[PDB]
Amino acid sequence: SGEYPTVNEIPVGEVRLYQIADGVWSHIATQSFDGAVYPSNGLIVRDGDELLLIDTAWGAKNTAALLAEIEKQIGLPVTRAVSTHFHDDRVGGVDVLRAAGVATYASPSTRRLAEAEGNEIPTHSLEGLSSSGDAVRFGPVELFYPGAAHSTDNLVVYVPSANVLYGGCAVHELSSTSAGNVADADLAEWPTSVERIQKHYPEAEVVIPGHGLPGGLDLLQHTANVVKAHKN
Ligand SMILES: CCOc1ncc(F)cc1-c1c(C(=O)O)[nH]c2c(C(C)C)cccc12
Ligand SMILES: [Zn+2]
Ligand SMILES: [Zn+2]
């Protein structure tokens, strides 16, 4: 009923959308992994009479449900998708997208890591993102590579029309007390990568983490703090 969706308010197998700004939504879904249940976020950005999708809904059936929820709530076609790193909460569902005619994209780094992991692999490679601080335009967003953080390949996404910063899994929600799933992280580089985000996007009004509740710019410093304490 208008609050940011959580596992307790998303019916089983379902996806919810949340309006972030004009022409910007997040998508929220639930998945189990190693016997625990987690929410995860992605983004939807209106691109004229089409939609750009950022990240899958973490799984094939969740991603099919995402497409249905978009049709119900928005009614514009998803034409392109970008995955912001190689983990299954970002690429799991890419095959569903591709069979629904969505063109799927990721950096070459992400595509290599996904292939090596046995995860689904986006079709198209996003060049121009291989050095930290790199940025490229992609429809109504800017893609930015801040350096290694949650993963070596993680990308962040900025929606300039709305000053929305989608941090993905490099950014944690304010209530978080741990650095999440760090198996592929660089805890030493992570603060430096966050500082790059902070420097590059000082006008961000909304910051969206990969998992949990959106907030403001404070999510960035909070993330650096949680990571530093995990590392120690
Ligand atoms: C093990 C604890 O993990 C988390 N704890 C709290 C969170 F808010 C997020 C995660 C989490 C993340 C992430 O931190 O991005 N990624 C995950 C994955 C990927 C590899 C598919 C699986 C299971 C959990 C997570
Ligand atoms: Zn991840
Ligand atoms: Zn994640």
Structural domains of the chain, with CATH: 7-231 (3.60.15.10)
CA of 209 to the centre of ligand 3 (A): 9
Sheet holding 156-159, edge to edge: 135-138, 141-144, 156-159, 164-168, 206-209
What SS3 class is residue 174? coil
Q: Do residues 219 and 196 make contact, with C-beta atoms less than 8 angstroms apart?
A: no
| Structure determination method | X-ray
CA of 49 to the centre of ligand 2 (A): 31
Rounded Cα distance between 20 and 197, Å, is: 20
**Which are the contacts of 201, defined by CB distance < 8 A and separation ≥ 6?**
144, 158, 165
Query: With the C-alpha atoms ordered 171, 175, 181, 187, is the resulting torsion angle positive or negative?
Result: positive
CA of 151 to the centre of ligand 2 (A): 7
Q: Is the shortest distance between the CB of 55 and ligand 1 below 6 Å?
A: no
Our answer to whether residue 85 is catalytic in this structure is yes
What SS3 class is residue 19? strand
Q: Give the residue among 58, 100, 107, 62 at the shortest CA–CA distance from 78.
A: 100
| Residues listed for the chain | 232
Residue nearest to atom 9 of ligand 1 (CA): 180
Residue nearest to atom 4 of ligand 1 (CA): 180
Tokens 């959308």 locate to: 17
Q: Return the ligand 1 atom nearest residue 183 CA.
A: 20
